[PDB]
Design a protein around this ligand. Structure first.
Ligand SMILES: CC(=O)N[C@@H]1[C@@H](O[C@@H]2O[C@H](CO)[C@H](O)[C@H](O[C@]3(C(=O)O)C[C@H](O)[C@@H](NC(C)=O)[C@H]([C@H](O)[C@H](O)CO)O3)[C@H]2O)[C@@H](O)[C@@H](CO)O[C@@H]1O
Ligand SMILES: [Mg+2]
Length: 123
């Protein structure tokens, strides 16, 4: 397996101050096999949910040949509204990833996107 996994995540997901939310991403791979421990939802700079979105939670569950990545949490009532770019990163059993931190950063400079990138919109 040299072929990377593919995340399907909505390009925008909208959450609301004071409310709980739940959205999903799904993941396929040519090998149908994954490293779930290395499948995460994170911001650019580190494998963390990110400043201003520390309450962004996720879980990863395999069902058949797909991963189901639940993206969920409770938005604090006093969170800053606006847009937050975040990433679903998946890893196949062979260690291929859909996007690396370096690919994410280069896309950010160039005003573009990588597979698994999404916009978290807080209202
Ligand atoms: C601080 C800085 O300019 N660092 C750049 C770095 O820039 C970040 O790149 C991100 C890529 O995921 C985003 O483009 C960040 O911008 C936004 C975002 O997440 O979309 C803009 C939003 O308007 C802003 N939201 C609010 C409510 O202010 C968010 C938010 O501050 C952050 O997500 C943190 O929660 O930020 C952008 O800041 C990137 O361009 C790299 C490339 O190497 O270079 C510097 O590190
Ligand atoms: Mg693969």
């Amino acid at each position: 397996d040299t072929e990377r996994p593919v995340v399907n995540v909505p390009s925008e997901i909208t959450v609301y101050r004071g409310e709980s939310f739940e959205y999903f991403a799904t993941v396929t791979d040519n090998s149908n096999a994954f490293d779930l421990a290395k499948t995460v939802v994170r911001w650019l700079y580190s494998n963390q949910p990110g400043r201003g979105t520390e309450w962004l939670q996720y879980s990863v569950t395999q069902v058949g040949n797909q991963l189901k990545v639940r993206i969920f949490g409770n938005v604090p009532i006093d969170t800053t509204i606006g847009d937050y770019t975040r990433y679903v990163v998946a890893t196949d059993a062979a260690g291929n990833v859909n996007a690396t931190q370096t690919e994410m950063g280069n896309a950010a400079v160039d005003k573009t996107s990588v597979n698994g990138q999404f916009k978290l919109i807080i209202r």
